[PDB]
Design a protein around this ligand. Structure first.
Ligand SMILES: Cc1ncc(C[n+]2csc(CCOP(=O)(O)OP(=O)(O)O)c2C)c(N)n1
Ligand code: SF4
Ligand code: SF4
Ligand code: SF4
Ligand SMILES: [Mg+2]
Lengths: 1163, 166
């Protein structure tokens, strides 16, 4: 049959049919494969063996690889899905699986490796890092090829006994939606070598015919034993070739180890791999038709590299070859495929000029114009070697010049772009539109979706294509027949109409009439609309959704508007297909919700209005841009162009060579995405600063000021007298940042006043006023205040050093980290694991961590997902070494002729260098005396003082903080976390426990509780939550605390200060509510209160220092719960979707046994 | 050195003696509740080893057997290797327990402490192995401090297992 799938589903489709076991661990962009395979098993899909696939999630990809090895050696056909850092961790077992000649297929959505920076996007770096493991390597260039070559790998590996890596380009193919021919499981079973399967069973580990494998070998036999597998590798090309003939006879699609496309007498040929082959062939057709003698060799079987099969498809007329590698091996003579092609041609005496280049790193665009640039370089008198395409390398001058722009899209292909808002339904509707068009017409259909780094309110751009010819355009749309803008705010912000064809369609969602178009649309947009004679349509979709009762959901409305004007299918047929999809999506929602979406379709047809614009729009002229403010070079040259969706134009000279970024750059974003913002009521405010404590974006803060400093304040900057003996004679005001607020509403819910002192008002109504208010509050001078930092009120007068991050509205993680920076941020270093905290904490080019007025703030680093504890441990060793070097120079100063005040501060620092307060006090004294002391010295004594000044940034004792999610702490990094805690180092571990993998969409973890439903736990998690805190208490010398800000502010304050002051390892497990729980994020703090009150989350503190004082180290901070445990589960969707009753009873019994055990440790 | 190395034991990468105590792998595995955990030593009790091996294999679930294995790296007469394991349990150096999750399903206590009261001297067992006596030959002033911590940690471990059984 024909279905519209993406690469991941196409790969899982074949892997599911051919496998008994799948041991997995999630990683973008390969995890959709394991997710859909788990869903199919949950609904009872049968493989070719008549059984459902067994999906097992491990603690890491290393654990997955070992499970693959054991399952294979014991007689089960086993597969797995991975990519990038995950593939690296499987490399050790890949050597074993190949060495033991076990049939296997790893499905890899090829993704870049983490180098100077992490990248979730696609290139071949991960697959190339494993090319020496002995796995065969088979590359798929399109979604159709993912379907076909996945079957080839599974069939070939049984015959050859050589395991396969079947890889396809991450996102660019794994997430590209295409209508393809889907191979039936029954047809797969007719091609399987069942004798080869039975022989595999006979080799299995079995006590009734046992054997030994995995021995240790001496030099006498190891070399011979390693070469004994040569026949299997010599035979694999012929076996793969023959399997390709089986698939050809079944499907009609003919694959070869190397395929050729282009002129039979071509003189310039590109050798490439992966989805680039699609782009190159489309370009080759265009150039060959124009008379150019060019061609393309597609590499399917990269390993083993068969010289015979490569040379057979190489035309004898070839004089020049350009090899394209989607990877970079720094310092290498050339990249892997280039060195293979160069080698094979030398071994056979071919006099062919060969040149290698790099492309598409991290999903860098690779379009036909770049393909021609490669062909033009082959046509030059001296072709450039070791080149790059797709960038402007103005430092080392490796990039090829993109001379001209060509359009190689096949004629008759319709092209549409959809600019949407994050989670507004645009992407989902476009996927449904592709399914509609693919299922009911003869046209090929293609979809690709560009996402944003911002989790809420980000920009999404959908790229859709339909045509009578196969769609090989594995690149973004250049010339669109239709462009849709589903968010009117984008008008004037992004280049929406870029590249639209003359006479094309522009569909807009806005409340503006045709006359208001003159004043609302920018001049450049009006010029494009008029000159290209576009059909301009507008629709007030929000008005329709409001009147019907759908709120502000416009997904059904905007999809209806698209088919009405696109002329892709008969309008009457489209309306039926849309309503049929509505029944499939909203049939379970009820009868009322159904007919509302039916009314959305009907009203959308009549509300679509064509805008008759005057021809004089073509001559409109840009308005004079206001005098722009002088912004820093990084903001002006890097941050603004990236946010303007122009980062691809930045040349190499723009960036640091090591991926180092400035701090405090999110304050320049000012996204202004909130619908409502808190308005402060001065008369109801008790000045408690709890609103500043719970804000996940530091958008609301208290401000103190002497009455003289309120001089130039706007009339609306209403203040109140400051409560407290510390702030006597001062003014107080709770001020919100309107453009940085998210409208989550946590501050209004936490406000404990009798009458609410914070009320949610629409942003647009008060935005002009509050911007002037915030601009004055932000420029207020610093006020020296003696408020106790150990209190909630006192800590919020300290400046937050984590602000305006990309976390969701109401995120339960960032308030914890924000509070830590307010207590110790002046002197802390952060080692952050991969996950949500690394995405909102460190997504280029904006850094939410910032500095205070002295320029001091947290230094931030993220290494890997698995190494974060050891990462911060290494930092602690280095900081201790740097303080030792400083202490050595200061001790020498005591023997030097320096002032008595300098020696007094030096002795005070030496005695208290390991105390936070004393090291700052005497450290700041030395800093104040240094400039004068150096002036009064000369010779070697002056050098001794200059060495102290060189190291003065280590006088204050540092605070190492190891921050990461529960998936890091409980699973992949648990082994490293256990070791660092056992080491005794003075580090502070903060685990933001969301009980799921929050970043990757919500997959299961060991921190997931009983009965909770997440990915890889479709039927609910049976095993209970692993008690990380209890295992850390077994050491006795580890400070362990369980906290929840929503439940107790004072208990959180008490544990954080105790953990940091403790001279040893400290572990803080913080309950972090998340959007994946299925709750109202407005009441994120309230959900943590119900968690502790229902016995779901404990509050305790384990202080090893109490044991030395003769006291009980374990303190139970909440002994008797007052809320029902079963009622708390009912407040989150992650538990209600199970309804199942057996899991709810098991979850309550585990919470009582855990609470009773904590009572035993305290008694 | 390993995390299973005890306090005061001298090994490579622990030239001055291991300061941190032995990681309690059995205690962490019992935190799950559904893992069968047992600590055995053949030289100390033949019948207790028979009991744990059969219970662990018949248990329909994960089973963990931590067996004390005397080694040449301990610095002992391997002729009396079985006897060295008996002195370890008799001195409170190595515990004998069994954590049976099936007993919890029967309403009983899953944890059974198979050796409650030690009768031998803890320090006398340490002086019978070279891996501890080389610490006394290296740093005499620091050896007494490490031996005292090892005996205090072993008594706190014994008191914890008595609490789980009571
Ligand atoms: C070796 C490796 N495997 C998988 C991944 C993909 N990955 C990164 S973070 C993450 C899950 C994050 O979970 P958690 O630690 O709980 O943080 P959270 O997002 O919940 O805050 C995954 C699966 C990776 N980056 N590296
Ligand atoms: S509504 Fe949310 S984001 Fe806005 S100030 Fe209040 S807590 Fe902060
Ligand atoms: S929570 Fe309410 S009462 Fe407390 S400081 Fe904020 S606005 Fe004032
Ligand atoms: S932890 Fe949850 S709420 Fe916070 S940023 Fe990640 S997905 Fe959003
Ligand atoms: Mg998590």
């Amino acid at each position: 049959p024909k279905q519209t799938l993406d690469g991941n589903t196409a790969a899982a489709h074949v892997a599911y049919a051919m496998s008994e076991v799948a041991t997995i661990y999630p990683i973008t962009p390969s995890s959709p494969m394991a997710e859909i395979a788990d869903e199919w098993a949950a609904h009872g899909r049968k493989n070719i063996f008549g059984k459902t696939l067994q999906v097992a999630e491990m603690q890491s990809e290393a654990g997955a690889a070992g499970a693959v090895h054991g399952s294979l050696a014991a007689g089960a056909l086993t597969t797995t899905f991975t990519a990038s850092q995950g593939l690296l961790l499987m490399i050790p077992n890949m050597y074993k699986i190949a060495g033991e000649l076990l049939p296997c297929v790893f499905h890899v959505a090829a993704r870049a490796l983490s180098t100077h920076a992490l990248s979730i996007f696609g290139d071949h770096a991960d697959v190339m890092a494993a090319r020496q493991t002995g796995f065969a390597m088979l590359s798929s260039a399109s979604v159709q090829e993912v379907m076909d070559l996945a079957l080839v790998a599974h069939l070939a590996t049984l015959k050859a006994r050589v395991p396969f890596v079947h890889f396809f380009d991450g996102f660019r193919t794994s997430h590209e939606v295409q209508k393809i021919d889907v191979i039936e499981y029954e047809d797969m079973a007719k091609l399987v070598d069942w004798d080869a399967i039975r022989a595999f069973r006979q080799r299995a580990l079995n006590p009734e015919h046992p054997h030994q494998r995995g021995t240790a070998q001496n030099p006498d036999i190891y070399f011979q034993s390693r070469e004994a597998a040569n026949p299997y590798y010599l035979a694999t090309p012929g076996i793969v070739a023959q399997v390709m003939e089986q698939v050809a006879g079944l499907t009609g699609r003919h694959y070869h180890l190397f395929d050729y496309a282009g002129a039979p007498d071509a003189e310039r040929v590109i050798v490439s791999m992966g989805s680039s082959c699609e782009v190159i062939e489309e370009t080759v057709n265009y150039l060959v038709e124009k008379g150019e003698k060019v061609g393309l060799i597609k590499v399917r079987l990269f390993r083993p590299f068969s010289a015979e099969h490569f040379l057979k498809v190489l035309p004898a007329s070839v004089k020049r070859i350009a090899v394209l590698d989607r990877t970079k091996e720094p310092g290498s003579l050339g990249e892997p495929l280039y060195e293979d092609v160069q080698t094979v041609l030398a071994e056979h005496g071919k006099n062919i000029l060969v040149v290698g280049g790099r492309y598409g790193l991290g999903s860098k665009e690779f379009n036909p114009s770049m393909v021609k640039a490669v062909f033009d370089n082959l046509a030059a008198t001296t072709p450039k070697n070791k080149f790059t395409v797709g960038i402007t390398d103005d430092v080392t001058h490796t990039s090829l010049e993109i001379k001209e722009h060509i359009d190689t899209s096949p004629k008759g292909t319709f092209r549409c772009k959809f600019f949407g808002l994050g989670s507004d339904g645009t992407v989902g509707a476009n996927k449904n539109s592709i399914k509609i068009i693919g299922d009911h017409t003869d046209m090929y259909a293609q979809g690709y979706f560009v996402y944003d780094s911002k989790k809420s309110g980000g920009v999404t751009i959908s790229h859709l294509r339909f045509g009578k010819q196969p769609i090989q355009s594995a690149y973004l749309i250049d010339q669109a027949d239709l462009i849709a803008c589903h968010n009117p705010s984008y008008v004037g912000r992004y280049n929406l109409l870029e590249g639209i064809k003359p006479g094309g369609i522009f569909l807009l969602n806005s409340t503006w009439s045709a006359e208001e178009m003159d004043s609302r649309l920018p001049a450049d947009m009006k010029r494009t609309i008029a000159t290209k004679k576009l059909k301009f349509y507008n629709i007030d979709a929000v008005k329709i959704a409001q009147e019907i009762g759908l709120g502000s959901r416009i997904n059904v409305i905007m999809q209806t508007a698209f088919f009405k004007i696109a002329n892709v299918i008969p309008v009457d047929e489209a309306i039926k297909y849309i309503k049929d999809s509505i029944v499939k999506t909203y049939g379970k929602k009820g009868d009322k919700i159904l007919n509302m979406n039916f009314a959305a379709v009907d009203r959308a047809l009549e509300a679509l209005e064509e805008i008759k614009y005057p021809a004089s729009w073509a001559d409109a002229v840009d308005e004079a841009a206001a005098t722009v403010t002088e912004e820093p070079e990084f903001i002006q040259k890097v941050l603004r162009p990236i946010n303007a969706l122009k980062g691809d134009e930045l040349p190499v000279s723009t960036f640091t060579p090591d991926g180092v970024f400035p701090v405090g750059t999110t304050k320049y974003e000012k996204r202004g995405i909130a619908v409502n913002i808190p308005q402060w009521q001065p008369e109801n405010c008790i000045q408690c600063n709890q609103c500043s404590l719970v804000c996940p974006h530091a958008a609301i803060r208290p401000y103190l000021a002497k009455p003289a400093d309120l001089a130039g304040a706007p009339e609306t900057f209403v203040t109140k007298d400051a409560i407290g003996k510390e702030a006597a004679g001062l003014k107080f005001r709770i001020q919100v940042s309107p453009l940085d607020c998210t409208g989550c509403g946590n501050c209004a819910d936490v406000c404990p006043a009798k009458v609410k002192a914070l009320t949610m008002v629409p942003l647009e109504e008060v935005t002009a006023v509050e911007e002037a208010n915030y601009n004055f509050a932000e420029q207020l001078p610093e006020v020296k205040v003696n408020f106790n930092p150990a209190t909630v009120k006192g800590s919020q007068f300290r400046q937050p050093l984590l602000e305006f991050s990309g976390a969701c509205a109401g995120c339960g993680e960032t308030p914890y980290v924000k509070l830590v920076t307010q207590l110790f941020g002046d002197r802390m270093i952060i080692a952050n694991a991969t996950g949500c905290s690394s995405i909102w904490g460190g997504s280029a080019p904006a850094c939410p961590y910032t500095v205070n007025r002295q320029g001091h703030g947290p230094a931030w680093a993220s290494s890997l997902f698995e190494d974060n504890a050891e990462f911060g441990y290494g930092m602690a060793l280095a900081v201790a070494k740097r303080q030792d070097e400083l202490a050595t120079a200061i001790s020498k100063a005591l023997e030097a002729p320096v002032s008595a005040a300098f020696k007094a501060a030096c002795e005070g620092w030496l005695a208290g260098k390991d105390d936070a307060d004393r090291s700052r006090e005497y450290g700041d004294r030395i800093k104040a005396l240094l400039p004068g002391e150096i002036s009064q010295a000369s010779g070697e004594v002056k050098d001794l003082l200059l060495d102290i000044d060189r190291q003065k940034d280590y006088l204050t004792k540092k605070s190492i903080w190891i921050i990461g999610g529960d998936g890091w702490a409980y699973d992949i990094g648990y082994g490293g976390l256990d070791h660092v805690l056992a080491s005794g180092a003075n580090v502070n571990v903060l685990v933001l426990d969301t009980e799921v993998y929050s970043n990757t969409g919500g997959q299961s973890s060991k921190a997931t509780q009983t009965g909770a439903v997440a990915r890889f736990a479709a039927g609910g998690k049976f095993t209970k939550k692993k008690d990380l805190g209890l295992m850390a208490m077994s050491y006795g010398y580890v400070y362990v605390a369980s906290v929840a800000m929503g439940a107790s502010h004072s208990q959180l304050m008490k544990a954080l200060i105790e953990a940091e002051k403790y001279d040893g390892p400290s572990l803080i497990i913080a309950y972090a509510p998340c959007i994946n729980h299925g709750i109202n994020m407005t009441y994120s703090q309230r959900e943590a209160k119900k968690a502790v009150e229902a016995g779901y989350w404990p509050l305790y503190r384990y202080n090893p220092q109490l044991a030395q004082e003769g006291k009980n180290p374990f303190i139970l901070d909440y002994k008797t719960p007052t809320a029902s445990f079963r009622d708390f589960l009912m407040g989150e969707i992650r538990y209600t979707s199970l309804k199942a009753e057996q899991l709810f009873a098991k979850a309550e019994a585990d919470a009582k046994a855990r609470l009773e055990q904590y009572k035993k440790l305290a008694e | 050195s390993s995390k299973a190395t005890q306090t005061g034991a001298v090994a490579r990468f622990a030239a001055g003696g291991k300061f941190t105590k032995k990681k309690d792998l059995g205690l962490m595995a019992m935190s799950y509740g559904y893992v069968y955990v047992a600590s055995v030593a053949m030289g100390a009790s033949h019948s207790q080893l028979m009991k744990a091996l059969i219970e662990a294999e018949k248990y329909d679930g994960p089973s963990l057997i931590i067996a004390y294995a005397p080694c040449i790296n301990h610095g002992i007469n391997m002729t009396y290797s079985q006897r060295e394991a008996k002195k370890a349990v008799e001195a409170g150096y190595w515990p004998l327990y069994r954590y049976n999750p099936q007993l919890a399903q029967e309403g009983k206590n899953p944890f059974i402490l198979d050796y409650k009261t030690p009768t031998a001297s803890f320090r006398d067992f340490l002086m019978g192995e070279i891996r501890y006596t080389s610490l006394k030959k290296q740093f005499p002033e620091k050896a007494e401090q490490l031996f005292a911590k090892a005996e205090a940690d072993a008594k706190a471990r014994l008191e914890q297992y008595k609490k789980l059984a009571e």
